[PDB]
């Protein structure tokens, strides 16, 4: 399912396609205008075309044409059968180059899918003062989380671990400086430590690297 991007908007889709993509690049994503539907976003002629994907509950189609049991069957059909997809009274639209849904960084401090409870246990057991990692937010899909071990090296303290939301909408923490990359945000906060409301300084001293 490389070409599927779970947590993006139509504007994000355009950005990826225009930045990482070439003509013929495409991806699928959830519909924002019609929750439960899906959307095919395709790059052609330097621009991006969005195409509604109907999800009836029983099948998927493009509001016409062939019907499919799964979203992946639909997408694979149109990739495999050049000429089956076209603009009405328009050109054939080629699904040539899938735009893969990639992690926001390759740094080993990024743990991807990891819950707060799971992050607390890893940092508590394998971290020490100032150990940190970044993970996906489970309660805010598309956002990220900086989880940091605080205070002395003891197992018990309140949790030994603080979690700070990183908005992705470009990346910020709580409406401060906006960064073009997660790596850039982490670099910044390593050098200029954030301070929690209640007064602890969150120094990012060493990563707790994934063993994944």
């Amino acid at each position: 399912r490389r070409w599927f991007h779970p947590n993006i908007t139509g504007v994000e889709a355009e950005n990826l396609l225009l930045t990482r993509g070439v003509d013929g690049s495409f991806l699928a994503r959830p519909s924002k205008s019609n929750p439960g539907d899906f959307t095919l976003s395709v790059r052609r002629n330097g621009a991006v075309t969005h195409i509604k994907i109907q999800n009836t509950g029983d099948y998927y189609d493009l509001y016409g044409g062939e019907k499919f049991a799964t979203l992946a069957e639909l997408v694979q059909y149109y990739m495999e059968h050049h000429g089956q997809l076209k603009e009405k009274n328009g050109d054939v639209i080629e699904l040539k180059y899938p735009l893969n849904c990639a992690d926001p960084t390759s740094e080993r401090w990024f743990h991807g899918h990891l819950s707060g409870k799971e992050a607390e246990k890893l940092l508590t057991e394998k971290g020490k003062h100032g150990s940190f990692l970044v993970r996906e937010s489970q309660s805010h899909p598309g956002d990220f989380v900086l989880s940091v071990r605080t205070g002395d090296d003891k197992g018990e303290s309140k949790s030994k671990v603080t979690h700070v939301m990183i908005r992705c909408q470009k990346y910020d923490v709580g409406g401060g400086e906006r960064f073009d990359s997660l790596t850039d945000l982490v670099e910044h906060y390593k050098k200029n430590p954030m301070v929690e409301t209640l007064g602890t300084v969150l120094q990012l001293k060493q990563p707790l690297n994934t063993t994944r």
Partner: peptide, 6 residues
């Protein structure tokens, strides 16, 4: 903006 297709 959505594009109608066949």
């Amino acid at each position: 903006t959505y594009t109608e297709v066949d």
